[PDB]
Amino acid sequence: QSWSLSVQTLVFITSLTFLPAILLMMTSFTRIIIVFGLLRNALGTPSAPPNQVLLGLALFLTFFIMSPVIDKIYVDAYQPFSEQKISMQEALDKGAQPLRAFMLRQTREADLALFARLANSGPLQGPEAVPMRILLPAYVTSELKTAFQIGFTIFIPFLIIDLVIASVLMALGMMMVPPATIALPFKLMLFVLVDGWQLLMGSLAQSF
Amino acid sequence: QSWSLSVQTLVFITSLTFLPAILLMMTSFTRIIIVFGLLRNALGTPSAPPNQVLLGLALFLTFFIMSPVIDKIYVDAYQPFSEQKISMQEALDKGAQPLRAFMLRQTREADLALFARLANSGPLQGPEAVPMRILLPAYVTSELKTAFQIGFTIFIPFLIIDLVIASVLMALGMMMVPPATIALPFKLMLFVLVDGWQLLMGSLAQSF
Amino acid sequence: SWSLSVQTLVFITSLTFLPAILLMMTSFTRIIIVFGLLRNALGTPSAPPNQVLLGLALFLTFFIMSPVIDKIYVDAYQPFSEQKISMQEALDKGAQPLRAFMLRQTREADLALFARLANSGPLQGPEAVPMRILLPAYVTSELKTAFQIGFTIFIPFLIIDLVIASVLMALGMMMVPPATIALPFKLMLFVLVDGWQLLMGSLAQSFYS
Amino acid sequence: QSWSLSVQTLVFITSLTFLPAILLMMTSFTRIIIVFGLLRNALGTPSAPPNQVLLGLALFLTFFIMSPVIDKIYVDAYQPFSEQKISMQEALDKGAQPLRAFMLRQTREADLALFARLANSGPLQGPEAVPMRILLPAYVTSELKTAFQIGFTIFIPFLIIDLVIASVLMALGMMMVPPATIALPFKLMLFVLVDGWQLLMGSLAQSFY
Amino acid sequence: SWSLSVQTLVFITSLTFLPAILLMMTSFTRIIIVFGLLRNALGTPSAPPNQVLLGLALFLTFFIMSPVIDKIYVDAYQPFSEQKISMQEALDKGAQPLRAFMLRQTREADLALFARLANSGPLQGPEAVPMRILLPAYVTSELKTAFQIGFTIFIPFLIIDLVIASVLMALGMMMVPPATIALPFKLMLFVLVDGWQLLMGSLAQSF
Amino acid sequence: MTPESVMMMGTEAMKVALALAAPLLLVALITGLIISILQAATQINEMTLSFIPKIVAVFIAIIVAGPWMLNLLLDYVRTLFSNLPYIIG
Amino acid sequence: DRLDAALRFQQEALNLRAQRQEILAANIANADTPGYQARDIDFASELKKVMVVDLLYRVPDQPSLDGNTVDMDRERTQFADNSLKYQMGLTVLGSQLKGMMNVLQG
Amino acid sequence: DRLDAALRFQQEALNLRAQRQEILAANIANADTPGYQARDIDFASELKKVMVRGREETGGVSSPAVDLLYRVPDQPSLDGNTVDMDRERTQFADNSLKYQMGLTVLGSQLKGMMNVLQG
Amino acid sequence: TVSFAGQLHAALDRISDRQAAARVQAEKFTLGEPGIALNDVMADMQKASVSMQMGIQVRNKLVAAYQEVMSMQV
Amino acid sequence: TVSFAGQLHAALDRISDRQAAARVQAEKFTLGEPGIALNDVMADMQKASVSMQMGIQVRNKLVAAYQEVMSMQV
Amino acid sequence: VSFAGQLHAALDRISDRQAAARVQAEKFTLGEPGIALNDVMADMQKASVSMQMGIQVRNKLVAAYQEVMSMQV
Amino acid sequence: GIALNDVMADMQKASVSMQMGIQVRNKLVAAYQEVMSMQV
Amino acid sequence: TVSFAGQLHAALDRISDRQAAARVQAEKFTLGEPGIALNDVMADMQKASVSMQMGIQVRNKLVAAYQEVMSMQV
Amino acid sequence: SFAGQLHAALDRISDRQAAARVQAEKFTLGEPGIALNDVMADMQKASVSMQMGIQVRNKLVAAYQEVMSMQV
Amino acid sequence: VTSEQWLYWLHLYFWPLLRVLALISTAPILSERAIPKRVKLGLGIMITLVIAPSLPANDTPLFSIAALWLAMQQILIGIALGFTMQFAFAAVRTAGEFIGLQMGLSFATFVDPGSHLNMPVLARIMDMLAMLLFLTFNGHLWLISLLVDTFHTLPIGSNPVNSNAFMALARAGGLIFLNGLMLALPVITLLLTLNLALGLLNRMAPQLSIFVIGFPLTLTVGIMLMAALMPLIAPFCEHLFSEIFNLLADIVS
């Protein structure tokens, strides 16, 4: 039943091709990236942190968050395969389980029901048997919703600052003074004082 | 009469080149991707979810929508062809039927009439007389029109929020503030409290 | 005639220039320019994905060039396939219907200019124009016609933005972007007036007229 | 123990692709360009010097800042590599240490502690034993925070000018006069007379020390 | 002289940095910043297209580099054909006019700062300044010069705006925005005095 | 094709734009002028109370004359797209 | 097919050479049969006929007593010549096919 | 000019190889003709000569401007030709390999250049 | 009324019947049926090979042209 | 209930069984097991190579198509 | 006269050489006197070399055309 | 007449020179478009 | 705590070790060592080549993935 | 510094190419003491060095373009 | 025989191709991104195929600095022609943007200069109207003809060059402003009077005017004014094109 070596390396290279899709749709990369983009938009600085810096930060945060899952895959699936204890098929099947559990932990039952009803799947007893083709889109949708929730919540203190400065300027009669120019330095000061970067990364990690 | 195996292999491996074209023009990928892009434009932020996530999600949605057609093709064409019971050409002709029905069910009459006019078609008769080269462009045109119809009404609630916020802000007096900056968090709030993603997938699936 | 090896070599080599024939000798250029301009007009630079528009343009070109292809097949490909006309004469016989199709849609001014640039003698009738003059004249005429069609296409989608901006400005909402409001209305317009059937029919008539 | 020549060439060419990533996440560049991205906002001209001019100026400033680190890497690690007294693995191990020290001195302890806790690392005896996987993102975080601090401080004199000009305009009853256009030339005055560019680059270079 | 293939590789590689040469080594930054500030002065941020301003700055740069191009032609283009000097001695000889020009247009403070940024103590003479110290100093000097020219351009338009607002206030109007009234007067002043040709003449004189 | 045809194209287009925008702009202007003269008569001066009825009036304007605008603009676009292949050059 | 028309002549020549080779070997094998006439074909005329078989009797040289007209020397030379011409036809046909192939390879 | 000059030595050497092989084939063809002195050329001297002064022809019946020297005979023959077949076939094989070497060097240089240009 | 799909089907048929005819001739010659000659078998096989190479080259050219047309941006 | 991953798994497994069968047949022939012929060994080896090359080509086409679909600007 | 004319002339020359060699080969196979196997074989050799030259010229020419069409404007 | 040795060598030289011209023009055009895609 | 850098270093070390072993065996065989056979030398060299090709392909796929991920617009 | 190291690398590569070309030229004239295998090995080594230089140039140019395309 | 000298054909077909393609990439309408790149390249190739055989072929090698100087010369000529042509559309865009800004269409620029919020829709309207007029007057054919004609004036071969000539193109930067003022003038002036009229209304009872009555009235008045002014651009369009063309003819030489 064990695949021949040439078939094994063909599978390995073809799977390595799909790496960005796995990173985006199976890990926590998408939510962190969306929150970072929304935060950058929220400070009034559309291009202050370069895209590469934020992408690297999101990659490192994703690696740290997914370290337990990778450790489980190594210990349970990859290590026996590397010692020739188990074949590639059963190794992949065993490695699917920890990632599947992690994705189920961070999905919403309503989206799972939507995709199950849409795919005309029969009744499924418990979370033990849910196909990956059903779980992946539901997990992606749940990640999108959670990222938007976090971004909308983050948008609040800067809105408070903008409103208070606009009101202070308006009550002085300064009718033609735009509030963005005065608000941007104070947005930067607010984000600096609360130790914003490390606090936001810690909050993103804690939510996973 | 049957083609030689070398000819079958040549045709089979050449036909895989039209896979992106088939997916785009002939399936539900076009409408879903257009609606997703329009929703991204309507959210107030142009690139919040990366193109990769939307593309993968649209692919999964297209597969789930077309699964009955794929099952019909497998029963009619793939299975009896692989068992060496029908030839390749007859298998293709038989398998073109459910896809033709799917394309017809979503095709505007005016599009089909126009493209039959431009192809010199005269006495057409039964809906089962439309050739593939006439049916395909009409289906594409109908899909583009339907996607635009969905997008321009997806735009409505966010325009409502924008106008309400701008009117309240300017009537209150603060006319120097940018309404879109304050409006974006509220657009995200509306999208997450309605379950915009789940309901949008439900609507897109039920559009067929 | 040429040896069979030479004929096969020439056939294989000529199979290479198919994109050049499609772009510089066919109805593809006007349609693709009109589609690009229309996509620029509606404010969605990535809406119908390039592949969808390319497939639609290919099908439109196939439907439009049908009589020319039929005439080429009946006059050149059929006698050549039946060993009645040599390989070096089928090309010359088939280049004439395409030349006629390119001529009708070209323009006097371009023809006069490219007849002057080649220092060629007077061309009293259209029957004395070679391909070296008709090719770029046809290309320039097609470019100008496509740009004219696209630029009259552009007008309503800018009219809507103009009226949207004026209405927004009447009420003092000077900090509201007009493009974001105008895009749904432009989509609504292009939905209402059969956005694609009218454009498809207009382009097809623009060729057959 | 030394790697083969083929493996060494493969590793070198592969690591050549990470040059922008190394520059952004390991050198001074991140703090510089970001500040520039804010300075052009403070002056009131988003156009400002062109983007490429600012990027190249940041690159030159980064090279001048890392000249000591580059020299130490060249002396301790790359020189034995060229003079055949070291392998590629040992060179990679040895050359990173001065850069690790440079990154650590500008790394806030809180961010480093956060990334340790998040990696569940064991008790690190001393700075010298900090893993690079923990030092890199913490350095980037501290870099962003420091750049924002510098930018906010920079935003001060131009805010002073805008407030003074707006107060002068409003005290005279000239309420309908937008003060941004009036205050922009005075911001340019302030940046010219005080020699803003040279002072800012000197301040950045001294800040890294 | 080294290998021809290596010469081709180096030439095509150096062709890539052409925008860098145009921006950092020539004056193009100065004219482009002056044009941007002048456009900001008239109150219309999209009246002449960015393309047109870029091309005008390019033509101005070509003229104002024409003497340096001629010196390059004399010292490098010609003797590379007669083969009295070639490859090394010449590329550097041809770059020497650029060094002279950039020394002329660079302030002493920027050069001093960038020298003390590179620990180059024995830099005593002024014709042996290395390129690493000369380039960013020249760019900073160009930025300062462009900002000064932009402020000088700003002065008359600011005066016109202030005068228009003052007359509006003195005439009794307290709500009319002065920008709408002052824009056509700004244009008629700019055209009537023929601002553009004198501006280019001063820029050419500004070296 | 002739420049006379082109400039006519622009004129008729922009007169269509004028017809589309004239009711809303005129309604807003009339409401603003009425509120201003009432303020002058009553000696009341706040710059925000003139902004309130303007929105309501302009929004009612779409209720009453909106179908007419939608029918006029669609007819214009339909005729333009139908006459497109006859003004080609 | 046009491909047949190019290779028709050499294929027909090769087939005719094989048939005449069989006839000559039959003449050799039946050398000792009393009353056997040595038969042969005229290669050129039959090649015309196929491009656009009938057996011709060989003219006897020496009169034998048993009625056998097969001469060893004549048919041995003809056999060797036919073998050589069959090889030449194979060479020419292979060269034409190889040229048609290298035209296509790429 | 530069590319023409860089590839000129091997190109000229390969042309001279071709002409020398033509001469050797002529010697082999006339190997049984009575009264035919074998001809050959000094490759190095003629190569330098063609290098300094460009290739030239006697007419153009046309022939190169090379000096056709006589080969020293090994052993006498009554017919009166000095074509010794061992010498002819050794020079033929050596010239063959050297021409293949020239082709290899020139092809390597031309690829060594397309590698730079290609992008 | 020309049909490009019909023309491709006709060409593929021509190739497939040529290959099948050569294969059946080899079938009969292996089975020992009289009247079949080895040189004819080899010549027909080589003709079928040439026809298939024709088809492969036309396929390559058509696929390359289609990909270059579809890789264009409007 | 048709899953494309299932069909890919089936084809990959079939290729694997063909390769394993050819390998085991060659293994047994080398050990001198009576009843195995060299011609069949080579024929099955070549069939295994053909199947693997077909799998390679199908994978190449699928990966290329996926990369062209996945790189469009939405 | 022109580049297309020169290419047509080269193709005609190559085809004429190939046809001449083929006709001489058929004449030799016919049995007509005076045609020597030496000349047939040498002419077939020359025709093959000329065909290969034409193939190489076509290959390069196509490569150069593809290179030119790849230029970004 | 001209032999394959000369024909092939000049053919290759022309191909090389044409490729060099194409690459240099591509570099110049890319630099020009980068300059004109600026923001002033 | 599994680290990807450690795994990449281990894979590179394995490739280098296989290459070095093959090179050493070939060098010893050239020097006339008795207990080394030519077939083993060639097979070991081919195995080292296969391993290094696998490493190159994995590096190419990893670089493509990294360049795709780092080209986002966040 | 860095420009100096690049110049040194280019000089070494060109010296490789020149040595290989000179050895092949001397061997073409029939000069003794130069063997064919040495000529071929030197030619291949020069080609490898030149390809390495080309690859390094490509990576450096790509890195420079990626750096210069950032949005400040 | 079978020569086909390749260097001669390459040197004959290269430099005219460089000049034609340099004009193509910058000349208006012929440089618009909507055209596929291959169409532009093919048009340049075909124009060069028509033109080059009549010209004297150059013999300078492509592997020389003389080739670089030639390429720079062709690029300079092409971009100069295309840009001098583009100046007229720049002027029309300026006039349209100024009419629109006096409409009060984009008031956010007066308070936030270059703040990512600007819509010169009138500028676009008159820009595309100017493009349509340029297409009607067959200006592009003229451009191609003048590109061909500059050879007789300035041959491919490296020729010496002048100076103030470049200034002329740079000094053409004045025209964009100078002609723009006139087009506006026929409307801005009346708009000015309208604003003056609004001032008279504000000299009455304080406040209660401007930002509430001025904007809609001035918007409608600008709309109908310049709708009536549309027939006026065409003579000015021809005037602009003639100015650019004869300036090009005078200065290129």
Author numbering:
A (entry chain H), B (entry chain I): 36 to 243
C (entry chain J): 37 to 245
D (entry chain G): 36 to 244
E (entry chain F): 37 to 243
F (entry chain D): 1 to 89
G (entry chain U): 3 to 54, 83 to 136
H (entry chain Q): 3 to 62, 78 to 136
I (entry chain O), J (entry chain N), M (entry chain M): 31 to 104
Could you give the paper's own sentences about this structure?
The bacterial flagellar motor is a huge bidirectional rotary nanomachine that drives rotation of the flagellum for bacterial motility. The cytoplasmic C ring of the flagellar motor functions as the switch complex for the rotational direction switching from counterclockwise to clockwise. The basal body is made up of the LP ring, MS ring, C ring, rod and export apparatus. Here, we present two high-resolution cryo-electron microscopy structures of the C ring-containing flagellar basal body–hook complex from Salmonella Typhimurium, which are in the default counterclockwise state and in a constitutively active CheY mutant-induced clockwise state, respectively.
To obtain the C ring-containing basal body–hook complex in the CW state, we constructed the constitutively active double mutant D13K/Y106W of CheY (hereafter referred to as CheY**), which can mimic CheY-P to tightly bind to the C ring and lock the rotational direction of the motor in the CW state. The density maps of the LP ring, MS ring, rod, hook, and export apparatus in the CW state were locally reconstructed to the higher resolutions ranging from 2.8 Å to 3.8 Å. Although the structures of the LP ring, MS ring, rod, hook, and export apparatus in the CW state are highly similar to those of these components in the CCW state, the protomers of the C ring in the CW state notably undergo inclination and compaction, suggesting that the binding of CheY** induces significant conformational changes of the C ring for rotational switching. The LP ring acts as a bushing to stabilize the rotation of the rod, which serves as the drive shaft. The hook functions as a joint that connects the motor to the filament, which acts as a propeller to propel bacteria for swimming in liquid medium and swarming on solid surface.
